[PDB]
């Protein structure tokens, strides 16, 4: 969905607007932290 794809694009602002509150926002942030610059 758009949430998943916005994580993969590394745009953390979009976690809030495109992901459901709770685990899907957490998962968006954790993906970014795991695999986006400057975390990697």
Residue 6: which CATH number?
1.20.50.10
| Resolution, angstroms, 1 dp | 0.7
Structure-determination technique: X-ray
Q: Count, in order, helices (H) and strands (E) of the chain.
A: 3, 0
Query: Does residue 12 sit in helix, strand or coil?
Result: coil
Total domains present in the chain? 1
Classified as helix, coil or strand, 34 is helix
DSSP symbol at 39:
T
Name, in order, each residue with C-beta under 8 angstroms of 6's C-beta and a sequence gap of 6 or more.
Answer: 14, 15, 18, 19, 28
Question: Which residue has tokens 């976690």?
Answer: 15
Taking the C-alpha atoms of residue 22 and residue 27, their distance in angstroms, rounded to an integer, is 9
Residue span of the structural domain in which 40 resides:
1-40
């Amino acid at each position: 969905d758009a949430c998943e794809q916005a994580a993969i694009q590394c745009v953390e602002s979009a976690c809030e607007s495109l992901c459901t509150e709770g685990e899907d926002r957490t998962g968006c942030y954790m993906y970014i932290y795991s695999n986006c610059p400057p975390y990697v």
